[PDB]
Amino acid sequence: RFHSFSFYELKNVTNNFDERPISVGGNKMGEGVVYKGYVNNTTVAVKKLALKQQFDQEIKVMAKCQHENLVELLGFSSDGLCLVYVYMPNGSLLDRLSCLDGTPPLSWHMRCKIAQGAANGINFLHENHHIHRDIKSANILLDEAFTAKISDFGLARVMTSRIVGTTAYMAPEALRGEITPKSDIYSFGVVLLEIITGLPAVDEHREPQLLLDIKEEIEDEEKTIEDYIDKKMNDADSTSVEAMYSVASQCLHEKKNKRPDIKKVQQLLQEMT
Numbered sequence: 299r300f301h302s303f304s305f306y307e308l309k310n311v312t313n314n315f316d317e318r319p320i321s322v323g324g325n326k327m328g329e330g331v332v333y334k335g336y337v338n339n340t341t342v343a344v345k346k347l348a349l350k351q352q353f354d355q356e357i358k359v360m361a362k363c364q365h366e367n368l369v370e371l372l373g374f375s376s377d378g379l380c381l382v383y384v385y386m387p388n389g390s391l392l393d394r395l396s397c398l399d400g401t402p403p404l405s406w407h408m409r410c411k412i413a414q415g416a417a418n419g420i421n422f423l424h425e426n427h428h429i430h431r432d433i434k435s436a437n438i439l440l441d442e443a444f445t446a447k448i449s450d451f452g453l454a455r456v457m458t459s460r461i462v463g464t465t466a467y468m469a470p471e472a473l474r475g476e477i478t479p480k481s482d483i484y485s486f487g488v489v490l491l492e493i494i495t496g497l498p499a500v501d502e503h504r505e506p507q508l509l510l511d512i513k514e515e516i517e518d519e520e521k522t523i524e525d526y527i528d529k530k531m532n533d534a535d536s537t538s539v540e541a542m543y544s545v546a547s548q549c550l551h552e553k554k555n556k557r558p559d560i561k562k563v564q565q566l567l568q569e570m571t
């Protein structure tokens with residue numbers, strides 16, 4: 299299954315949980331807090347949790363779901379809570395879309411591969427009867443080849459009394475307390491809009507504040523998808539951009555039953571390229 303690490307082992311490999319960023323010679327990737335570690339010539343991501351149910355749920359889902367587009371869990375620590383993963387050198391899709399820390403903008407070609415990869419990851423989760431509940435660009439990680447890897451299965455799983463997730467990405471019924479794989483489809487629709495536009499899902503100093511509202515402006519003919527295409531690309535073609543927008547639009551249907559299933563989303567993204 300997974301390797302059982304003692305807390306002392308993870309303490310040393312992260313250089314005593316060096317809270318300084320990587321750029322200043324520390325071990326912090328970012329925020330629990332994520333630290334870069336080195337174990338048996340292999341680079342690892344150690345998430346020190348700062349909660350026990352989310353630790354147990356992450357281990358349970360990870361043991362059942364192993365896929366090319368899912369982040370891989372290597373081990374854990376519970377003596378004296380840490381989760382050890384395969385390290386993703388290119389961080390999150392949110393960070394790469396915002397060009398955080400001077401990284402070059404992602405090309406349209408890279409963005410298409412990322413969208414396909416993320417859809418393949420969600421498909422595997424849904425085939426294994428799991429609902430993510432927090433699909434967003436911050437939860438889509440990028441490996442050494444910029445392959446998309448869905449992360450954070452702490453909230454993975456019908457009604458609930460504890461509404462959890464990210465408001466800007468959440469489906470109307472998810473905000474109402476419902477738990478359905480169709481809510482993950484809606485959230486992926488927001489991610490597709492972030493990929494096309496390079497804009498975050500929410501920006502308080504922006505008009506409109508929420509990205510999913512651009513779908514209304516396009517449908518009401520107030521604007522077009524061309525007006526919203528990320529200008530930080532030089533290789534975007536109208537056909538494939540409209541094809542990705544069509545998938546995003548279908549995903550963002552307010553009525554959950556009118557949304558396509560992940561298999562259809564996966565099919566439409568493959569046809570796009």
Ligand SMILES: CN(C)[C@H]1CC[C@H](Nc2ncnc3sc4c(c23)CCC4)CC1
Nearest residue numbers: 327328329332343383385386389390449
């Ligand atoms: C704000 N940004 C700099 C963030 C900071 C956290 C970072 N997180 C990771 N970075 C590298 N590898 C991994 S594996 C794994 C995670 C992760 C989180 C869950 C499992 C993504 C970028």
